[PDB]
Structures are given as structure tokens and as C-alpha cells.
């Protein structure tokens, strides 16, 4: 009755299925930055845990009508999971219904373009349409544009939700794929961490251009008020100060980089 249920999401290189996952079981079926972070937190907080992939594969949004949550956030909110260890962005609306540790990773929305194509900035994109651009059809990135009060980003939002040929995508894979075949006619807006990862994987034909549009962080989430929150938060700060969080990113991002 003491095992901690960890809700997470299959997103490379955070949580991935090991090659021989079929001959494995339990937490051993998975590997990745977050699988490793889960092990380190558990050790530091002294608890057993079971990794479980979020059922609807969503991060966490609330319906404006019903006010019901889905994704990992919903798992925590509705008593399904005891902790969320994944690339979950710390946001206002979420902070109101669940707890978040201080960030374990710092990032920001960035611009992905087809390598060999002209550099583009948010400003640049907002002033045209020949080059289509969009975001994941759900998540904090799409929300950023919907709730920002910055002229440039508001202009970009108006354009994106109005773009007849939908500029949104359902998965990171889709966005990346779209960038790779659009010959510069499609710029994908995604979190810098993922942009950096893809840039380190074959075919190596994409790249992060310009600075980030904002500064956010991923955090470990627990149900509102959970006593597990305090220890977890302190574990994150300790892990970061010991340099372990940095070694984890180098391991899963740059150590096996395949683009030079």
C-alpha cells in the first residue's frame, strides 16, 4: 500500500521503450531521462514506485465548459497517480490544482526550421504567411500564445488559430516531419529541450534558430497538499546542485549525439 504510482508520458528521450522491452517487465521496460530522474528521486525520498504511462497520452488541460482535467494532471487530480515525473511544464492554471517542485529543467518555446533555410525569428514569422508555422495542438506551448499579452505573440496566435490549412499538429513527430518535407515553408514552434534533442538525431536536417520566446521549467507534480511534495522539491534542488541533473541531460541528449 506504500508504492508510489508515477504517471509519466512516452516522449523521447524522457521515457522510451527499451529495445528488448518485451522480454522485460515493470519499470525495467522503460529508459530515459525521466526514468533515471524517477530512480534518483525515489532513492532520495525513500519510496517504492511503479512507472505508468498516462492513459490518454496528454499532458494536462482543463475543459472550459466542464472544468474537467485530462492527461497526467488529471491522474493526479482525480486520485489515479501519486506523482508525475515527466516533461510537464509548470503553469498558472495547473499550479492552482496540483503542486510542483522547483524546476528540474529550464527551457522555453523555440523555433525549429529546415536546416539550410533562412533563419527566422518570432517577429519575422508574425509578419508573414508564406512560411506557415504552428504548435502542438495541445499543451503549454499552444496555451502560451492563447494567454500572452505580447503584441507579436498575439498576432502570431490570431494567425495560427485562423490558418485554414491547420498549422497545429497532434505529436512532436508530426511537427518535425512537417518541417522536414516543407522545404522551409513550415516552422515548428516547440519547447527548446525537444528542439535540441531532435537537432541531435538523424537525419540531422533541422535546427533551433533564434532565442527562446519565454522562460519556463519542467517540474515534478504531486496532488495538491501531498506530503510527498516537500521531500521531492528538496530532492530536485539537491540533485541539481550536485550537478546530477546536468549529467542526466548530457547523457540523454549530447553523449550519444549523432549529428556532430
- Residues of the shown chain interacting with ligand IWD in the complex, contacts defined by CB under 6 A: 11, 59-60, 87-89, 136, 139-141, 172, 190-191, 194
Residue 257, all three cell numbers:
549525439
**The Cα angle at residue 34 between residues 30 and 39, in degrees rounded to 5:** 80
34 binding partner (options ligand IWD, its own copies, none; Cβ < 5 to 8 Å by kind) = none
Residue 221 pairs with which residues in a beta bridge?
A: 84, 100
| DSSP 8-class letter at 205 | -
**The Cα angle at residue 196 between residues 194 and 16, in degrees rounded to 5:** 45
Is 121 marked as binding a ligand?
Answer: no
Tell me: does residue 22 bind its own copies (CB under 8 A). no
Q: Which is nearer to ligand IWD, 34 or 228 (CB)?
A: 34
Q: Which is nearer to ligand IWD, 3 or 166 (CB)?
A: 166
The rounded Cα 112 to chain-centroid distance in angstroms is 15
92 binding partner (options its own copies, ligand IWD, none; Cβ < 5 to 8 Å by kind) = its own copies
Tell me the CA distances in angstroms from 22 to 164, 193, 252, one per residue in order: 42, 29, 22
State the minimum distance, in angstroms, from the CB of residue 1 to ligand IWD.
30
190 binding partner (options ligand IWD, its own copies, none; Cβ < 5 to 8 Å by kind) = ligand IWD
Listed residue (57, 50, 87) closest to 74, CA to CA: 57
> Hey, how many other C-beta atoms are within 10 angstroms of the C-beta on 66?
7
141 binding partner (options ligand IWD, its own copies, none; Cβ < 5 to 8 Å by kind) = ligand IWD
Q: Which is nearer to its own copies, 26 or 225 (CB)?
A: 225
Chain positions 75 to 134 lying near its own copies, rule: CB under 8 A, are 90-92, 95-96, 100, 102-103, 105-106
Q: What's the rounded Cα separation, in Å, for the pair 193 and 138?
A: 17
Is 258 marked as binding a ligand?
Answer: no
Identify which range of 2-10, 130-138, 183-191, 237-245 contacts its own copies by CB under 8 A.
Answer: 237-245
The rounded Cα 38 to chain-centroid distance in angstroms is 16
Percent of the chain as helix, strand, coil, to the nearest 5: 40, 20, 40
Is 174 marked as binding a ligand?
Answer: no
**Beta strand ranges found along 43-192 (DSSP E):** 49-53, 83-84, 98-100, 105-107, 109-114, 132-134, 186-191
Identify which range of 8-16, 79-87, 117-125, 148-156 contacts its own copies by CB under 8 A.
Answer: 148-156
> Hey, how many other C-beta atoms are within 10 angstroms of the C-beta on 218?
24
Tell me: does residue 172 bind its own copies (CB under 8 A). no
Q: Which is nearer to ligand IWD, 12 or 226 (CB)?
A: 12
Annotated binding site for L-glutamate: 87, 89, 94, 140-141, 191
Q: Which residues here bind its own copies, judged by CB under 8 A?
A: 90-92, 95-96, 100, 102-103, 105-106, 144, 147-150, 153, 214-217, 219, 233-234, 237-238, 240-247
Amino acid at each position: 500500500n506504500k508504492t508510489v504510482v508515477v504517471t509519466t508520458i512516452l516522449e523521447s528521450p524522457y521515457v522510451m521503450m527499451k529495445k528488448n522491452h518485451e522480454m522485460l517487465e515493470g519499470n525495467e521496460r522503460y529508459e530515459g531521462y525521466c526514468v533515471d530522474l524517477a530512480a534518483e528521486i525515489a532513492k532520495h525520498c525513500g519510496f517504492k514506485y511503479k512507472l505508468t504511462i498516462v492513459g490518454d497520452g496528454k499532458y494536462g488541460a482543463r475543459d472550459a465548459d466542464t472544468k474537467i482535467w485530462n492527461g497526467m494532471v488529471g491522474e493526479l487530480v482525480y486520485g489515479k497517480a501519486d506523482i508525475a515525473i515527466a516533461p510537464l511544464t509548470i503553469t498558472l492554471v495547473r499550479e492552482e490544482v496540483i503542486d510542483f517542485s522547483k524546476p528540474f529543467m529550464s527551457l522555453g518555446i523555440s523555433i525549429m526550421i529546415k536546416k539550410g533555410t533562412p533563419i527566422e525569428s518570432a517577429e519575422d514569422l508574425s509578419k508573414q504567411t508564406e512560411i506557415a508555422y504552428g504548435t502542438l495542438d495541445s499543451g503549454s506551448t499552444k496555451e502560451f500564445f492563447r494567454r500572452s499579452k505580447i503584441a507579436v505573440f498575439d498576432k502570431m496566435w490570431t494567425y495560427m488559430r485562423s490558418a485554414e490549412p491547420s498549422v497545429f499538429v497532434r505529436t512532436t513527430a508530426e511537427g518535425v516531419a512537417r518541417v522536414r518535407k516543407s522545404k522551409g515553408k513550415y516552422a515548428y514552434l516547440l519547447e527548446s529541450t525537444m528542439n535540441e534533442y531532435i537537432e541531435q538525431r538523424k537525419p540531422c536536417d533541422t535546427m533551433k534558430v533564434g532565442g527562446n520566446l519565454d522562460s519556463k521549467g519542467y517540474g515534478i507534480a504531486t496532488p495538491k497538499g501531498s506530503s510527498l511534495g516537500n521531500a521531492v522539491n528538496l530532492a530536485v534542488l539537491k540533485l541539481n546542485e550536485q550537478g546530477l541533473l546536468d549529467k542526466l541531460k548530457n547523457k540523454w541528449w549530447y553523449d550519444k549525439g549523432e549529428c556532430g
